[PDB]
Paper text:
In chains A and C, corresponding to [name] (amino-acid residues 1–258), residues 1, 180–189 and 182–187, respectively, were not modeled owing to a lack of interpretable electron density. For example, one side of the SpTrpB tunnel contains βTyr311, βHis285 and the neighboring βLeu284, with the tyrosine rotated towards the active site of [name], where it could potentially interfere with the β reaction. The weak inhibition of SpTrpAB, which carries the smallest side chain among the tested enzymes (αVal61 in place of αGly66 in MtTrpAB, αLeu59 in FtTrpAB and αMet58 in LpPhTrpAB), supports the previous conclusion that any substitution in the loop would drastically reduce the size of the BRD4592 binding pocket, limiting the inhibitor affinity.
The [name] subunit converts indole-3-glycerol phosphate (IGP) into glyceraldehyde 3-phosphate (G3P) and indole (IND).
Residue numbers in the entry:
A (entry chain D), C (entry chain B): 4 to 402
B (entry chain C): 1 to 181, 188 to 258
D (entry chain A): 2 to 179, 190 to 258
Write the structure that this text describes.
């Protein structure tokens, strides 16, 4: 099975968590199977995804971008058109709905930049559930606007003063609050990381990306399968949501674009599968950037949503059995893609998705105009206009 | 066949004495791992039962804020599993040592390499907080026919059926942990219930900051593990020596 | 007809422009009739709105908001889910695609807040056409983010330095550019306010809102028609696009919410149909805020997208023949509607649409639980988060 | 046969070039009280007519100098009602051509505007934002009156469009343009025109006034004269040489 009984995708995954947390993830796996056996659960979620989030998102043939590159045809899975403007809402809405079926009343999560905190707070307000988002205090001071967004949606943001007051401390604060209030609180992991069954739950809720693209590509082009799939990779939620519905279609190649930061051979990157190796972190056996003694190294990227040292266990499995390729994409390469898609197609992409766009133009030249690819446009770039404008202005006066 | 740690701790229990196990972070010292011998002999001369020795890890999930800071202090010196092994091979002591490490540094070093390199040391136990019962097959096979006991951790709020599943065949001692910390009367009852179905000493790893806390937990278990109070004191240059004397001398 | 050959909806409308501009308007109407006769023009436009913009947008039954108010069932036509986050793109896309049919190569427009500038630049990029957005210099120095947005989309932002350097000067700068280059340039009017045939063209491109909503209401509820329609009015584009497909259904009431600013009886408001009388402005005979001597008064509103002194002539017709009611909504009521929808439904609305939410709350209580209404959620309110945050912090300090 | 048509046809028959200054009503230190002083100043120079503008808050066919004069006039409180009251005291032999955008005229009432100016020197009317397609808003009210509705014609439009706007026109024709390409358009218009044609471009020197006298029947000056009277600059000699120009 994938994952198997103990939560392994091949050699990777599991639930390497303390016994105090083992009770919560066991209960969560049991409640998850019961929701899969119930047809009324998936039906209510399908209708809400349709009427509230706006699914299904179109598969848009980027005609201008395709003609500009002169290579393979590029089809963009328009996840940027979701309510909230990114894919994260698929997982959070599915997990809040699961929390309602469990009889829970409180929703908690952590965030760094703020994306998962907004998606979680949105899904909680839809279901009239109390929401608490844990942030490191140093992140609260830097994200006053996202803090206002989450409070606008009715959520309470709890600043974590302990430790370094960053995302690493908010994760522990949220996990400790999850165990303490297990009888009425559900913790929503934001990506395809963490202990079993979180990678499986996040994958299935994000599989609406690939299942729609597969049927949309056929109804649109008349062909059977695209030749390649491309998605950016942080923890791996949007990539595995696009890949998994195609995993048994051997002719469809898969590419996950990693954040190479300043350069794969520099001190500031996030290329997990290019420079990392298997280790145990965040309750999962996975590839992770680490020193020779097993200490986790800091990840760097121009896009905050991709600076994670690890990667989902299912992606490490794909990388192991050579089912998917994982390519580094640099800070500057992602900036070109951000500006390119804006003026060529009129779509302002997120800095995360710009890594996929950037590699998309590379792969397009390689495959030639006789092939086709589906790129997951994970999010819109409004949250990144301020950062990009400063970066291009600072570099203008300096060069 | 029987592990040394089980017998040594039964002897403390037999003498009507509570088991007292200090918890220190290896490398949390002015001169890093070079201060480990000094700290151990300092605790040995106070007559403690065993010494829990921690391996610092960059992302702990089960330590309190005092121990988390001790891990950061230790990593600055460059403390690694490899260097601790080299230090432990030169440590002579009659006190049994219990390695505390999160699984990744052990996993990178190699569990078999770790066990075999520590064959003739004072290491008698092993605590891996993030290696649950469901993944014990990563370590348990390599501990067969050795003198290193895999210490199981038990959450008191769980069901007695789950707790007994974790205790089955355990050696050394049982590490009772509790979520967070009326409520305190239910802890003593859940803790005393684990003491019955258990066949080896049951040690409390909760908040022990005074002699009253120590004597409260000895009424329902076999001893305590003190970490944060000793780590904070040793680093801040605070008195702790007399607190350990009274703790060791406690007559059940 | 409606409008007749002279461009009049009852008593309002017309082509009150100088003779230098009449040729551009007469060419526009001629070519527009050609696009209505060619079936491929709609087939192509229908697919792009589907693939690129994201249509059809769902009609969302706001369950929480309906039970919170306790009255009529509230259905939200989710124009906030459109690409670019507003309804304007419907009109910019149709008019640029109309300009593509006319053999034009350059697209121009003016904007004050920047929303129509962004929408026009987005549509021009889609069809690979040159775009210049005329913007008053006082607006350019205050909207640095939207100016960078328009430049990201490949558009040139022409800072109008002549005159008082406001939206009034940008209209002149844009219209002079249109006539001087009429052989290659087309001018995009932002709302349903202007000389014939612009109000008719804007209404028809925006009729996808009410056309989709009529069928979506029947598919979702099994009932025949809603009891009322609510929409905010600036120039009138999003409201007439919701109203017009229902115009022949007498049982459907229509409500357009005007910006009342600090108060209708004060000097800072924008309630055109409440405190205005018929005048001639922007090349059309309409109701407009004016003094006794014909000078056009300045309009004020918390939402800059609604501070227009006049209103589209078809709304003046709707208002005159009692087809639609026009009700004013103060800034304070809209500011509460902004926070109400964000917390109750997890949807952050535009400050413009917050006027519609504010009135829909009142109307839902009055109609009762046995009735239903469709509210046009014209746009999302990410663009308004910064403003609302500062306003809420300023109101708490003073009081 | 109205007065403005015959007055200007005589200037063309006498070999002289038609000269129509364009002032803005109320643009003075005393406001509308200085209008009599301004009209009588230009009368001693022998101008053919006088274009008087009504300031509007949203002008569409005015240059930056004229728009700057309209705002200067709005401060003193100049309104259509206030100008009609002043024109009842204006006595002059020069015909006056009132320029106004349609909304100040629409609010005051078209019929009220005509009836209240019957005994005045108002002989022509220019409404830039009132196209030929909406002449019914004004033309029916100008029958049996001495006020001519001045048509504006864009030289770059088709000749059939131009002949459509000139049919039955009185007073004069106003030629507008969106440099040698215009001379062909303006001469073709003078060919099919029965009344005089006038050019309302930005003539700044004597050479510009003469360049269009070979093809049109006269020029209209505004910016140069409005800016000179505001800044206190010499303009009085420039207007003399323009009137005395022989063709």
């Amino acid at each position: 099975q994938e994952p198997n009984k103990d939560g392994f995708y091949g050699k990777f995954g599991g639930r390497f968590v303390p016994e105090t947390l083992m009770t919560a993830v066991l209960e969560l796996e049991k409640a998850y199977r019961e929701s899969q056996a119930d047809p009324s659960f998936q039906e209510e979620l399908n209708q809400l995804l349709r009427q509230y989030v706006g699914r299904e998102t179109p598969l848009y043939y980027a005609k201008n971008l395709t003609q500009h590159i002169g290579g393979a045809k590029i089809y963009l899975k328009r996840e940027d058109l979701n309510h909230t403007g990114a894919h994260k809402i698929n997982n959070a809405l599915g997990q809040v709905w699961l929390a309602k079926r469990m009889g829970k009343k409180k929703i908690i999560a952590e965030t760094g930049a703020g994306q998962h905190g907004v998606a979680t707070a949105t899904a909680a307000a839809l279901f009239n559930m109390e929401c608490t988002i844990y942030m490191g205090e140093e992140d609260v001071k830097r994200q006053a606007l996202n803090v206002f967004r989450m409070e606008l949606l009715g959520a309470k943001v709890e600043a974590v003063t302990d430790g370094s007051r960053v995302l690493k401390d908010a994760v522990n604060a949220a996990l400790r609050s999850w165990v303490a209030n297990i009888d009425d609180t559900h913790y929503i992991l934001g990506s395809a990381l963490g202990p079993h069954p979180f990678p499986e739950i996040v994958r299935d809720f994000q599989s609406v990306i690939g299942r729609e693209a597969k049927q949309q590509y056929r109804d649109l082009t008349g062909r059977d399968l695209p030749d390649a799939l491309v998605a950016c990779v942080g923890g791996g939620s949007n990539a595995i949501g696009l890949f998994h519905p195609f995993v048994e279609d051997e002719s469809v190649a898969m590419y996950g674009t990693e954040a190479a930061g300043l350069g794969v051979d520099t001190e500031h990157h996030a290329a997990t599968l290019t420079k990392g190796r298997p280790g145990v972190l965040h309750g999962s056996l996975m590839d992770v950037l680490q020193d020779a003694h097993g200490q986790i190294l800091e990840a760097f990227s121009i896009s905050a949503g991709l600076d994670y040292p690890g990667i989902g266990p299912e992606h490490s499995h794909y990388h192991d059995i050579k089912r998917a390729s994982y390519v580094p994409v640099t800070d500057e390469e992602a900036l070109e893609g951000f500006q390119l898609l804006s003026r060529v197609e009129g779509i302002i992409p997120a800095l995360e998705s710009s890594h996929a766009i950037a590699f998309a133009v590379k792969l397009a030249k390689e495959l030639g105009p006789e092939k086709s690819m589906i790129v997951c446009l994970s999010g819109r770039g409004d949250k990144d206009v301020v950062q990009v404008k400063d970066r291009l202005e600072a570099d203008a006066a300096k060069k | 066949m029987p592990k040394t740690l089980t017998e040594k701790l039964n002897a403390i229990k037999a003498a009507g004495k509570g088991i007292f196990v200090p918890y220190i972070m290896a490398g949390d010292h002015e001169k890093g791992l070079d201060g480990l011998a000094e700290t151990i002999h300092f605790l040995e001369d106070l007559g403690v039962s065993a010494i829990e020795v921690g391996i610092p890890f960059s992302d702990p999930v089960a330590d309190g804020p005092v121990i988390e800071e001790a891990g950061l202090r230790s990593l600055a010196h460059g403390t690694s599993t490899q260097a601790l092994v080299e230090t432990l091979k030169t440590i002579e002591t009659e006190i049994p040592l219990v390695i505390m490490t999160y699984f990744n540094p052990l996993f990178q070093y190699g569990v078999e390499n770790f066990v075999k390199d520590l064959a003739d040391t004072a290491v008698k136990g092993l605590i891996i907080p993030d290696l649950p019962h469901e993944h014990a097959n990563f370590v348990e096979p390599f501990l067969a026919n050795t003198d290193i006991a895999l210490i199981p951790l038990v959450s008191l709020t769980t069901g007695i059926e789950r707790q007994k599943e974790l205790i089955e065949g355990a050696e050394g001692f049982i590490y009772a942990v509790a979520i967070n910390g009326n409520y305190r009367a239910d802890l003593d009852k859940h803790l005393a219930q684990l003491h019955q179905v258990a066949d080896i000493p049951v040690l409390t790893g909760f908040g022990v900051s005074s002699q009253a806390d120590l004597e409260r937990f000895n009424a329902v278990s076999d001893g305590v593990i003190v970490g944060s109070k000793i780590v904070k004191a040793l680093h801040q240059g605070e008195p702790i020596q007399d607190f350990i004397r009274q703790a060791v001398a406690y007559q059940k």
